[PDB]
Ligand binder design. Structure first.
Ligand SMILES: CCC1=C(C)/C(=C/C2=NC(=C\c3[nH]c(/C=C4\NC(=O)[C@H](C)[C@H]4CC)c(C)c3CCC(=O)O)/C(CCC(=O)O)=C2C)NC1=O
Ligand SMILES: CCC1=C(C)/C(=C/C2=NC(=C\c3[nH]c(/C=C4\NC(=O)[C@H](C)[C@H]4CC)c(C)c3CCC(=O)O)/C(CCC(=O)O)=C2C)NC1=O
Ligand SMILES: CCC1=C(C)/C(=C/C2=NC(=C\c3[nH]c(/C=C4\NC(=O)[C@H](C)[C@H]4CC)c(C)c3CCC(=O)O)/C(CCC(=O)O)=C2C)NC1=O
Ligand SMILES: CCC1=C(C)/C(=C/C2=NC(=C\c3[nH]c(/C=C4\NC(=O)[C@H](C)[C@H]4CC)c(C)c3CCC(=O)O)/C(CCC(=O)O)=C2C)NC1=O
Ligand SMILES: CCC1=C(C)/C(=C/C2=NC(=C\c3[nH]c(/C=C4\NC(=O)[C@H](C)[C@H]4CC)c(C)c3CCC(=O)O)/C(CCC(=O)O)=C2C)NC1=O
Ligand SMILES: CCC1=C(C)/C(=C/C2=NC(=C\c3[nH]c(/C=C4\NC(=O)[C@H](C)[C@H]4CC)c(C)c3CCC(=O)O)/C(CCC(=O)O)=C2C)NC1=O
Ligand SMILES: CCC1=C(C)/C(=C/C2=NC(=C\c3[nH]c(/C=C4\NC(=O)[C@H](C)[C@H]4CC)c(C)c3CCC(=O)O)/C(CCC(=O)O)=C2C)NC1=O
Ligand SMILES: CCC1=C(C)/C(=C/C2=NC(=C\c3[nH]c(/C=C4\NC(=O)[C@H](C)[C@H]4CC)c(C)c3CCC(=O)O)/C(CCC(=O)O)=C2C)NC1=O
Ligand SMILES: CCC1=C(C)/C(=C/C2=NC(=C\c3[nH]c(/C=C4\NC(=O)[C@H](C)[C@H]4CC)c(C)c3CCC(=O)O)/C(CCC(=O)O)=C2C)NC1=O
Ligand SMILES: CCC1=C(C)/C(=C/C2=NC(=C\c3[nH]c(/C=C4\NC(=O)[C@H](C)[C@H]4CC)c(C)c3CCC(=O)O)/C(CCC(=O)O)=C2C)NC1=O
Ligand SMILES: CCC1=C(C)/C(=C/C2=NC(=C\c3[nH]c(/C=C4\NC(=O)[C@H](C)[C@H]4CC)c(C)c3CCC(=O)O)/C(CCC(=O)O)=C2C)NC1=O
Lengths: 172, 162, 241, 60, 162, 162, 172, 172, 162
């Protein structure tokens, strides 16, 4: 897997080049702003049950057909697998947020996920909707200003949104 | 590449668990150590040509015999390859400095090193001499911690060669 | 031509070759290129879990997670299906990781997912993949394992995998099995790589029996044929046209 | 019935592992393996093929 | 227990390699963050009695029916056990703060938590409410990074409960 | 699902051998036990609505607080979901009665039960109270072997919850 | 794996409903006739070597090309594989007879068998012929009046015939 | 696995006949020339590092594009895999030369090699070129007379050339 | 098929190495002793008719009871396929002689021998008798190394039949 630093290094190696001064400046900025990234990752981690519960409640409120007999979260086993899926995707989004790179979503979380769902028969539109709902419920805990020094974290919010949307778009 | 963040994520993922305080503190240590490491890499990049030329000549000094006709260090191509190899080593050491882990050296230089050197009849002692050189001058090019990270990575490469 | 002549003669040969050597290649291939293509970067780079006789709770639970993720083919095992007695025996030291794997593959979880709703071809390729970390190398393995199960039963057929010299030389009583066949193994048949790629479905793929069609084989024609059947025509094509 | 085998190595296993190379991380020689009757025959001869030496077999 | 140093050394041992920069940086982050953690430990230990009594009162406020007879919280023995359990949680949170890892919590609270609670019909929401009260009162008498550490460990415990 | 017939056939299949006398005897016992079991299933099917209403009211009687505002029993949707869940348990109990095996309950209810009740914060004790009420009522709906068949499946579900 | 009971239950679960009184009557009749069904399964199991031997003798009397050099059962390993296959198919026919459902026969035996035989060069017409000859031998043994109570077992005969025919159709 | 003897036996069995006298004469001739064949195989074995090193030198001089940053033999581990593959193919050509038949080389080494290389992204033309360069380097040591009694071995040289050409045309 | 060349090649392949000295000298021995083996093969091919007829009659003498009506050997077809089976055995013995390995015997006769004989109710003692008669004849037909070479394979087949 890659983080932002190893991704810059890999892109520099294809050129046979040392890392440039602008690249070093970008990586110094990334690291210097890393404490906010750590706070955001802790925000995703500590509120993960709340995020998943909120997203699941909304998902099965919008789409009752998922929990009807014949629906794809109907018995306890299918619902349990659904909740495992949401928790896994959120965990991987937190990994990606820590890394500053989406390589861990491409290599691990989404490596064969669309094919898994297609073969199982899972409606990937509902999965993407679940990921969108998790994004909506996670932005709140990211933007929560309590217990943290105030500052500008718009970039972190955008990056987390890109990770969630990458997951959703790779599903569907 | 095996870096602090990457091993954090990989160890958490192998146990199927979120990132907890332990791993976040490791990440914090990495993000704090970035400044010395990045400006040490800056210093090493700015002086790549002098370092590589000095390393090649140091190899020719500690191994005079290779310079004579009929063996490895003879010819323009062989010495250009010496310079290219030493530049490779310096490049991946700066990479490791920036990435805060032995990952680039491990994946680009150290994986497959012995087989390749054996196949092409390349002495690890040449590269050890070059890296001891680079170590000596990185001592005076760098001060404080930056010297420390640079020398951990250079000594990691030397240990890989021995 | 004037610029070519200034680059040829005006400067010494040494730096000319030096910089020509370090020019980027037209193949723009990172070190992970090739592993990313086959989708096996994670399955190659994940840690090798080794569980000794004394161990802590974190090491034990992580080893359990790794074991259930590999031996059950990345399929969900609910809390009711998890073997508590076998975990206890492994916690005490009565059985090794190998003995735990043997118990797991004899369990109704493994059987119901990989044996009962399958053909024996699928079960054999799937047990090779899960217990040896590699794909079958030829049709003789298929015949051997079908005969073994038919004459002695499921448990003997599991013991064939777990007591194999291959298993002990690579995993050997303490390490969780991992995917070996993404790297060249000695004795491999040049198709076991392709067959493990065709068996592997990425990091998020599983070997579930809950797919729409069912649990069906993958490598029957490739194994029995021994290849694609296009190689003679490839040899023709590499001639005139 | 189940029997416990005490296994030791004193050079034959060492010679084999030096020829073949260290393929999984190194472990101590002496260890006890519990085997059922059904697998008692292979495991022991397996331990003989690996060059291992057994010192005691207990019936419990 | 799972601390920063222990995870470092376990990962290094699993590859059978020495401790290098990618591990020393993690240990450095631990040593940097040790001071807020120990300060939070002092703060949580000094106020432990008031914290425990207030947490028990918060549990009885949020779940009034528990006090009614025929319910789990009726009787002085049950309420003494309540105080004892909240003290256990607070003590292991202090341990986890000191060790800079979730190891104390995992080994002494999390491992076997669900089965134990189910067997004795203990509602995890009681303990979640008590830990939420402790989090709120940790919002006071802790400042800055020490409060961050205490809140992270308490949130780890809460996430394990639910 | 795991029935008498299915376990018989799967045992013979995993052993690579024909069905012998022992398995035919197991099947015979199944085919005999079918008459009381199907009679019990038909009786429980006739009285499913009354049983569900009674179980829901028993749940509310034993846990009066849940119906209070701010808790899981408040609102018409929540109580409708109560009725739905009790209907599910009753339906899968009759499925297991017809099938002569715990297979319907293990596959459709028990597999995943803990994770789901934990995620949605459903108390297993509510369902245990509802199933105990249904147990008592089927004690009055049935008699003889029908009664013991239905009771065995009901409290298989009960032990699954506890 | 399924039997008649599990199949009906799965259909009812898809409908989301209880088993209807007509379905309960069907399953009651099934369990009532289960003793005859056990007799039929025992007829298959006790006489299996005779069934396979008779089918093999008739098959290789009809198709001498199968046992000649170049035939698909020429050496002992190929003849043993042929006889082994015949026993395996008969055994899954007996399992399907006991279950009252063909799900185990489809999932285990006939799963990818046509493609296996095609890739091996096994003539699938001859495999189907072998299955027909086993059906005939078995039909002789299941209709035996000795050692049983005389009664009407035509439903069992037809069901066993359907299992054999489904095997032979799936193979060819 | 098939050598000349097993291949002749397989044909004879397909016909259903004993080996003819002419076949026995061909097999006796093969056994007579076996000592020269063994000398050729030992020449391929003992000189393997020289052959691989020579072919690698000429390959990487011819197309330096492979060892440049971004090339497929660029990093140490990919260069090592390159040398390892050349070792493997030469090993299999020696096996095929001892056997007198290309069945081992085709079955164990060549059936899946090309799509392995395609999946990895390896340039198959360069692999075939490396095999050709090993051919050219190996013929030199194959004709070396030192420590060996002089004699004619043109059939052996032609056979080894056809094995190398089989490998190159199967890979390319 | 498994012959000396195949064994040495497969052993070298399983170890991922070139054919060393021992394997090459074993192949050398195989090539040298091909001449006696091919001599034996040609001899036993020339006298196949007399050998087969004599083996059939030897079996009938040592098992006089197999010929009367209702027995396995009764009938012209059973006579003919007695001759056919013994012809197969002799053919595969010549194949093993030519190949200088028991591989043809192993693959075309021995693999699957017991199951087939059991299925069709063929006494292996019959073929032990026939091969013993052929063994008695080959002592007359062959000399020196050729005789021993054929005797090894006939003994191998007799052992397998036991
Ligand atoms: C086929 C097997 C199966 C079962 C058994 C099952 C139970 C079940 N009931 C649910 C809803 C619920 N169930 C209850 C429980 C009842 N409601 C209250 O009136 C009573 C106090 C209480 C009596 C037991 C509640 C409160 C909810 C709402 C969940 C929420 O909004 O968080 C949910 C959450 C998904 C949804 O929104 O529908 C599940 C999974 N689901 C299944 O697929
Ligand atoms: C890379 C990490 C990783 C991921 C992401 C992953 C996803 C994943 N989800 C699975 C099943 C499932 N996934 C779902 C979830 C769907 N149900 C719908 O209602 C929802 C919209 C949606 C979830 C939000 C369900 C219901 C199943 C069970 C399918 C079944 O039982 O038939 C499976 C098959 C395993 C099994 O069925 O037992 C995988 C592999 N696995 C992994 O190792
Ligand atoms: C144990 C794990 C760990 C964590 C969690 C951690 C977080 C952390 N947060 C900090 C302050 C801060 N924290 C934040 C982030 C917050 N600001 C806004 O409210 C956002 C809503 C939110 C982030 C999304 C910001 C902006 C600062 C100011 C410090 C700076 O920007 O340099 C600091 C530096 C103290 C300072 O100079 O003020 C750290 C180290 N450190 C650790 O070792
Ligand atoms: C990215 C990591 C990487 C490294 C480190 C690397 C080293 C490397 N150097 C090589 C050549 C060489 N390298 C040298 C170096 C010698 N020249 C003398 O002046 C000195 C005494 C000495 C250096 C200190 C020589 C002589 C050769 C040519 C060897 C030959 O072809 O005979 C080769 C063989 C391929 C080629 O011919 O270009 C490799 C693989 N390659 C890599 O991909
Ligand atoms: C458990 C369910 C299952 C079955 C039954 C099954 C059948 C099966 N039969 C096989 C071979 C075979 N099968 C036959 C049978 C044929 N010979 C004659 O032509 C007849 C017409 C016909 C039988 C009546 C033969 C001769 C082979 C040998 C393969 C070869 O030709 O090399 C093989 C390949 C492995 C081996 O060679 O032993 C399978 C997998 N596979 C399964 O997973
Ligand atoms: C037993 C028969 C057999 C063979 C021969 C075989 C070849 C083989 N070569 C491989 C990789 C490779 N092979 C090569 C060699 C090629 N690329 C270079 O540029 C050259 C043009 C050329 C050599 C002259 C390279 C560079 C790789 C690494 C590609 C990658 O990892 O992305 C791999 C993938 C596993 C690994 O990397 O260890 C296999 C399986 N496998 C077999 O089972
Ligand atoms: C937990 C870490 C660990 C250690 C340390 C360890 C020690 C160890 N040393 C061994 C052999 C050995 N160890 C030594 C080293 C000693 N003899 C020399 O004279 C020196 C005085 C001295 C070293 C300073 C030698 C020479 C052998 C070979 C003994 C033999 O083959 O007979 C072996 C057996 C190797 C085999 O059977 O393949 C082990 C297991 N094992 C472990 O798992
Ligand atoms: C690893 C090398 C090796 C050893 C050490 C060995 C001895 C040996 N003999 C055994 C059983 C046995 N051995 C015998 C031997 C017979 N008893 C008397 O009647 C005869 C005088 C005597 C014949 C010489 C018997 C009867 C058993 C069965 C004991 C039982 O089951 O109670 C077993 C247990 C078989 C199992 O549980 O799977 C072993 C290991 N065989 C081996 O391959
Ligand atoms: C040890 C395992 C076991 C077996 C084998 C078993 C069979 C069994 N067969 C029975 C009778 C019977 N069995 C048959 C079936 C036969 N009659 C027809 O002619 C067919 C030729 C043939 C079926 C293909 C019939 C028709 C009855 C009479 C019972 C009835 O019609 O209800 C009975 C009832 C007692 C009796 O009337 O003799 C049993 C228990 N039960 C067991 O627990
Ligand atoms: C240690 C393993 C081993 C080997 C390798 C071996 C081969 C071998 N080849 C020999 C002769 C020979 N060797 C060759 C082969 C040569 N022809 C050309 O000069 C080439 C340089 C070269 C092969 C390309 C020829 C033509 C003969 C003479 C013909 C013959 O003796 O049959 C001899 C001398 C025997 C004699 O002629 O009386 C031996 C021992 N024997 C062994 O036990
Ligand atoms: C290539 C290796 C091979 C062998 C060895 C072989 C033996 C063989 N002989 C057979 C027939 C037979 N073979 C015999 C044996 C002979 N008849 C009597 O006159 C003698 C007492 C006796 C010889 C000593 C008999 C009695 C049969 C008929 C059995 C039947 O009715 O199916 C059959 C059954 C198929 C058939 O021909 O109808 C086999 C498989 N088949 C092979 O493919």
């Amino acid at each position: 897997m890659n983080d932002v630093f190893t991704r810059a290094i890999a892109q520099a190696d294809l050129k046979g080049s040392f890392l440039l001064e602008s690249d070093l400046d970008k990586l110094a900025s990334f690291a210097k702003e890393g404490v906010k990234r750590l706070d955001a990752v802790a925000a995703l981690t500590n509120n993960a049950p709340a995020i998943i519960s909120d997203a699941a409640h909304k998902l099965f409120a919008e789409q009752q057909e998922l929990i009807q007999p014949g629906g794809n979260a109907y018995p306890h086993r299918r619902m349990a697998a659904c909740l495992r899926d949401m928790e896994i995707i959120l965990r991987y989004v937190s990994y990606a947020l820590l890394a500053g790179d989406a390589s861990v979503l491409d290599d691990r979380c989404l490596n064969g996920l669309r094919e898994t769902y297609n073969a199982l028969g899972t409606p990937t539109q509902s999965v993407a909707r679940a990921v969108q709902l998790m994004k909506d419920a996670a932005m709140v805990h990211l933007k929560s200003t309590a217990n943290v020094t105030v500052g500008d974290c718009s970039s972190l919010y955008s990056e987390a949104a890109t990770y969630f949307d990458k997951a959703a778009a790779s599903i569907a | 590449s095996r870096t602090v963040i990457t091993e954090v994520i990989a160890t958490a993922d192998s146990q199927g668990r979120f990132l907890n305080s332990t791993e976040l503190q490791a990440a914090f240590g990495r993000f704090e150590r970035a400044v010395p490491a990045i400006e040490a890499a800056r210093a090493l990049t700015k002086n790549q040509d002098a370092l590589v030329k000095g390393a090649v000549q140091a190899v020719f000094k500690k191994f005079p015999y290779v310079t004579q006709p009929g063996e490895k260090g003879y010819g323009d191509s062989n010495q250009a390859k010496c310079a290219r190899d030493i530049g490779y080593y310096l490049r991946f050491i700066t990479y490791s400095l920036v990435a805060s882990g032995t990952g680039p050296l491990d994946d680009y230089v150290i994986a497959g090193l012995r087989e390749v050197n054996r196949a092409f009849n390349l002495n690890p002692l040449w590269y050890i001499e070059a890296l001891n050189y680079i170590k000596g001058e990185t001592g005076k090019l760098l001060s404080g911690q930056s010297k420390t990270e640079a020398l951990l990575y250079i000594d990691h490469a030397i240990n890989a060669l021995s | 031509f004037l610029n070519m002549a200034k680059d040829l003669t005006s400067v010494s040969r040494a730096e000319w070759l030096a910089k020509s050597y370090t020019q980027p290649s037209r193949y723009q291939q990172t070190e992970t290129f090739g592993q990313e293509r086959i989708g096996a970067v994670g399955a190659i780079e994940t840690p090798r879990i080794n569980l000794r006789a004394p161990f802590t709770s974190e090491e034990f639970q992580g080893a359990l997670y790794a074991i259930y993720r590999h031996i059950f083919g990345n399929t969900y095992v609910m809390e009711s299906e998890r073997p508590t007695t076998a975990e206890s025996q492994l916690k005490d030291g009565r059985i090794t990781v190998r003995g735990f794997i043997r118990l797991l593959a004899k369990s109704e979880v493994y059987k119901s997912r990989f044996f009962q709703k399958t053909s024996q071809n699928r079960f054999i390729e799937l047990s090779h993949k899960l217990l040896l970390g590699r794909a079958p190398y030829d049709q003789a393995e298929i015949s051997y394992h079908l005969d073994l199960w038919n004459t002695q039963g499921y448990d003997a057929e599991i013991d064939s995998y777990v007591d194999s010299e291959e298993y002990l030389d690579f995993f050997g009583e303490d390490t969780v099995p991992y995917f070996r066949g993404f790297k060249y193994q000695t004795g491999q048949s040049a198709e076991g790589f392709n067959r493990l790629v065709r068996l592997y479905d990425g990091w998020a793929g599983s070997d579930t029996d809950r797919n729409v069609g069912g649990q069906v084989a993958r490598l029957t024609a490739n194994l029995t044929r021994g290849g694609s059947g296009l190689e003679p025509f490839i040899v023709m094509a590499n001639s005139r046209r | 019935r189940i029997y416990k085998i005490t296994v030791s190595e004193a050079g034959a296993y060492a010679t084999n592992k030096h020829r073949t190379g260290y393929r999984a991380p190194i472990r101590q020689s002496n260890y006890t393996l519990t085997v059922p009757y059904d697998r008692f025959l292979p495991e022991m001869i397996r331990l003989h093929q690996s060059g291992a030496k057994i010192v005691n077999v207990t019936s419990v």
